[PDB]
């Protein structure tokens, strides 16, 4: 599923992720935008032969199981398939877990180089919520 904006705006607010740890709406908003293009379905190959998974391009590093990222975690205990589905309910509860981690959003290198710092409310601008 590819999410409009404020469509995907509202899922997040609805699964608890505005102020999570302390990160506006704007902030999900902008790494989703950044990591999918709101793009449920979105998987990259990374260097170390991990693969991301979802709108919140989840790492089977640590994160997910895939059965292909040799010494890997599953500390969201799912499958990385599950974070491709049309409800965000396992991305959103698994960013929960990533986010609580030490780093909090640094964890996602597309957030700390394309949103930290920046005006994120405009990613929620004329949203309903
Ligand atoms: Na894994």
């Given at each position: 599923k590819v999410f409009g904006r404020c469509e995907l705006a509202a899922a997040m607010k609805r699964h608890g992720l505005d102020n999570y740890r302390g990160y506006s709406l704007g902030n999900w908003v902008c790494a989703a935008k950044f990591e999918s293009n709101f793009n449920t379905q979105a998987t990259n190959r990374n260097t170390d032969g991990s693969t991301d998974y979802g709108i919140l391009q989840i790492?089977?590093?640590?994160?997910?199981?895939?059965?292909?990222?040799?010494?890997?975690?599953?500390l969201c205990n799912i499958?990385?398939?599950?974070?491709?589905?049309?409800?965000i309910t396992a991305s959103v509860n698994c960013a929960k877990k990533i986010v609580s981690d030490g780093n909090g959003m640094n964890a996602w290198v597309a957030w700390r180089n394309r949103c930290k710092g920046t005006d994120v409310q405009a990613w929620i601008r004329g949203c309903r919520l």
């Open positions: 790492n089977s590093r640590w994160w997910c199981n895939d059965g292909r990222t040799p010494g890997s975690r599953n499958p990385c398939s599950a974070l491709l589905s049309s409800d």
